[PDB]
Structure 1
């Protein structure tokens, strides 16, 4: 009752303490800025620095433990609901391991070969129908061998473990679970070493969701972005190829040549120096150069590299500002088309904000009533609530449609004043 009670509690009290883990991370960063070099902690008039320090550090690790417990309570069943639904319908409509046998991509999928052996399989799609239905439909024509291919403190080693082992392997495929679990391990490494303990703060990247839109505006185009910057680095690489092979003695970090002249006849550290300055030069690759004494090579190197710093300033900047501001514009595009199509076409409607303003305030009511988005959902509840005997022939009819998943009960969106008017 302790365990199940706290399961129900971390169910009902989860995002509050998620915001508290946020706030405790803030309290970490407020104080993790008073170090002094053997390393120790400075003292000011709040005479509880080190005690409450250690307390709230291990306590924030405890909060991470709390949120991973509450997350195991959280949408993990919806995860496996999606998963078991997916697998059971790709047995139902498909029968993938029967005959179809998918490829080596998504052993997320092929992982689920042996869970069909586990007779406890379609728990979290409530659909124990699917096993014997596939056995009847698909299994009979391909045989009883295929039926055998798919059929075949105290309580610790006496249950369907491989079902649960499979389940945990599915659990490890998650991204948000891996995210929060890696966050938890950061909290653990703070108990081992409370100096990378303050490195938790990448969780605010999935924290307040505007910041997540910022990071998405980074990352949704970020394939092109990162591959582009790699291409840019190759451009600078090849530039430093070009910016060596005549220009081999000139540019030196040295004290005029008394200290040994720092021009790089290594190719590699020439790249390193060049690249370094390019990404931290400011003026370009001309800052560290000799005075234009006026060799025929020297007109070449001056005009050469001032134009090539210029071309850096062209290419890498144009990458940065074009890619990012157009990413922001794309982020605009998404939500503006959202707010367009919400104000025009309900999903069950899909006609427009046109007929239902010829009915004045008929679009208001049309939205609220005619397609009333969650009420068709509530009817799906009502089907799941009622029984097919208890159903109407209309209810069982559309239920039979739902057995087909053929959707034709849903109209073109032409409503009751579209049939007559």
Structure 2
């Protein structure tokens, strides 16, 4: 570090170069370990910082529980979320990702088994799909009561009965394995958001949140429990509120409010936050059809919709229906009224044309009943290609001839041409827009620096120039390793920077991330 810290700080020194060059088995041994950041260090001028990256933590920014959490976060902040909480959303990501890298290290005999399932989750939900093809390939051979036939050999229908009871087993081993891989994380982001709300702000003492914000009201059941911050690493949050609010209000009211055999009020609260978590319910519904898959074999054909949740350019299709969805109900709400408004006119003038019959000798079928004339238009008039002039007798020799051409030629030119274009239009332009936001993030991170926010133009200006600015000088992984490194340092051991940062991290100002300039934007 010392040989580095002069080469970075003082260039144009020929004495140091031959001095540096004989240490090349050392500097090119430690460059795996030499994490560099840049901060605005207390003097209104920006200086480098050098530290130690451990090796048990360089190999846990692999292990794709974390890399899944990175690519969700990176797409989260740079899409929406303004500058006033950009970096505050960064440190709120680095706080959680340390808890994942502790969870990744620990991943009677039951504890040995339970870590086999949380380890192999992504490699087991993939197996729960390949079985569901082999059910819905075998199930294609049915014939009519419904008995299966064979085409290959005699041993076909037992292999369905084997692969069906196997599928309930695997789909039960993918909500066990989900229960010990992601549920401890969503517990942690819930406990932080309650512990950092009653303490730094106070709501169960001062605000008392209303009947709106339901998840505020459910959190009231956990503060009376004993082992409250079970994952939030901060086991003295109970005493910090008493020393903060025990004098404006009673020291006895707070101690009533706060405080083989297990805690029961916490365990009732832990399940209360799993079942409203959105990604867990799909893992339940994917399992509860498997139990229903033995009452009838066809229910393993609803497991093919894991193609939808399981890919990327098919997850976007499924999301495009409800992305623009609020304008969608209001338009179908207009389409169902215009077709109704063309049913009142057709009922009150034109009963005599509506014959779905066969040439009059048949006891002719009519559509002179209001609800049945209504469902005649919605089922035949919309879905046709020419409007309503198809299933209506040809008007030629009639008193209402011109008064009925107008009734058809608007119907085609007001419902099928217009109103069933901007129904398809609000779905395709949803998919045409949502596939662009996931392309801008692919671009907005490759022509801008994340933490500086500078640009590819200024930082290029040398051969191979943006690459080194994001692989040495910022490299936002390093800003997470740095805040992992402060924790293992003793508080007496903090150097000059590492206790101006760590003090600022407690008060949470975040003025020390380099806002505008980096290093080369003030030197030369």
Q: TM-score, normalised by structure 1?
A: 0.93
How far off its partner does 1:73 sit?
1.6
Match of 1:113 among 220, 228, 231: 220
Q: In structure 2, how many angstroms separate the alpha carbons of the residues matched to 1:235 and 1:127?
A: 61
Q: In structure 2, how many angstroms separate the alpha carbons of the residues matched to 1:388 and 1:228?
A: 62
8 Å CA contact 2:118, 2:176 repeated in 1: no
8 Å CA contact 1:98, 1:146 repeated in 2: no
8 Å CA contact 1:92, 1:134 repeated in 2: yes
Instruction: Select between 115-124 and 196-205 the one with higher mean Cα deviation.
Output: 196-205
Residue-by-residue CA offset, 1:202-226 (whole Å, 9 max, x unaligned)? 2221112221122223332233234
Establish whether residue 351 from structure 1 lines up as the match of residue 450 from structure 2. no
Residue-by-residue CA offset, 1:82-107 (whole Å, 9 max, x unaligned)? 11111111122221111111222232
Residues 401 and 46 (structure 1 numbering): CA distance in 2 closer, same or farther, change over 3 Å? Answer: farther
8 Å CA contact 2:382, 2:415 repeated in 1: no
Residues 3 and 237 (structure 1 numbering): CA distance in 2 closer, same or farther, change over 3 Å? Answer: farther
Q: In structure 2, how many angstroms separate the alpha carbons of the residues matched to 1:419 and 1:391?
A: 27
Residue 514 of structure 2: aligned partner: 411
Residues 240 and 249 (structure 1 numbering): CA distance in 2 closer, same or farther, change over 3 Å? Answer: same
Residue 237 of structure 2: aligned partner: 130
How far off its partner does 1:7 sit?
1.1
8 Å CA contact 1:292, 1:299 repeated in 2: no
Secondary structure of the equivalent of 2:112?
Answer: helix
Secondary structure of the equivalent of 1:60?
Answer: helix
Secondary structure of the equivalent of 1:302?
Answer: helix
Q: In structure 1, how many angstroms separate the alpha carbons of the residues matched to 2:410 and 2:221?
A: 64
More helix, by proportion: 1
8 Å CA contact 1:95, 1:138 repeated in 2: no
Residues 162 and 333 (structure 1 numbering): CA distance in 2 closer, same or farther, change over 3 Å? Answer: same
Secondary structure of the equivalent of 1:141?
Answer: coil
Residues 221 and 88 (structure 1 numbering): CA distance in 2 closer, same or farther, change over 3 Å? Answer: same
Q: In structure 2, how many angstroms separate the alpha carbons of the residues matched to 1:129 and 1:358?
A: 51
Structure ranking higher on relative contact order (CA contacts 8 Å, 6+ apart): 2
Residues 405 and 240 (structure 1 numbering): CA distance in 2 closer, same or farther, change over 3 Å? Answer: farther
8 Å CA contact 1:140, 1:147 repeated in 2: no
Residue-by-residue CA offset, 1:170-214 (whole Å, 9 max, x unaligned)? 111111111110111000111233232322222221112221122
| C-alpha RMSD of the superposition | 2.0
Match of 1:271 among 352, 355, 374: 374
Task: Give 5+ residue unaligned stretches, structure 2.
Answer: 1-107
Instruction: Select between 253-262 and 200-209 the one with higher mean Cα deviation.
Output: 253-262
Residues 191 and 3 (structure 1 numbering): CA distance in 2 closer, same or farther, change over 3 Å? Answer: farther
Residue 322 of structure 2: aligned partner: 219
Residue 340 of structure 2: aligned partner: 237
Q: In structure 1, how many angstroms separate the alpha carbons of the residues matched to 2:333 and 2:492?
A: 64
Instruction: Select between 105-114 and 137-146 the one with higher mean Cα deviation.
Output: 137-146
Residue 187 of structure 2: aligned partner: 80
Task: Give 5+ residue unaligned stretches, structure 1.
Answer: none
Residues 223 and 48 (structure 1 numbering): CA distance in 2 closer, same or farther, change over 3 Å? Answer: farther
How far off its partner does 1:69 sit?
0.7
8 Å CA contact 2:448, 2:454 repeated in 1: yes
Q: TM-score, normalised by structure 2?
A: 0.75
Residue 139 of structure 1: aligned partner: 246
Q: In structure 2, how many angstroms separate the alpha carbons of the residues matched to 1:209 and 1:389?
A: 49
Secondary structure of the equivalent of 2:453?
Answer: coil
Instruction: Select between 316-325 and 52-61 the one with higher mean Cα deviation.
Output: 316-325
Q: In structure 1, how many angstroms separate the alpha carbons of the residues matched to 2:129 and 2:262?
A: 39
